[PDB]
Amino acid sequence: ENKSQPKRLHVSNIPFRFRDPDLRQMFGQFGKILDVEIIFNERGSKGFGFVTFENSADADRAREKLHGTVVEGRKIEVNNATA
Predict the structure, then answer these.
(1) Containing domain of residue 13, as a range?
(2) Structural domain total, the chain
(3) Rounded distance between C-alpha atoms, residue 29 and residue 81, angstroms
(4) What's the rounded Cα separation, in Å, for the pair 66 and 83?
């Protein structure tokens, strides 16, 4: 792949309390973020979201470091997003 291109990660099993700044803080360490999205329904957070990096190399590092990491009692999963 072309590592300069942006890349969206799917981040799941995140604490229900998380909001935008919480993901931004956790993933921001790895590089510039273009977008952050947490998904909700009428019962509140669904406990997953998307983080989009300006480049794929940064995204790949974030995924390698954060996938499977336990945060506030939850093993989070970080995967490349799909349709």
Answers:
(1) 4-83
(2) 1
(3) 20
(4) 22
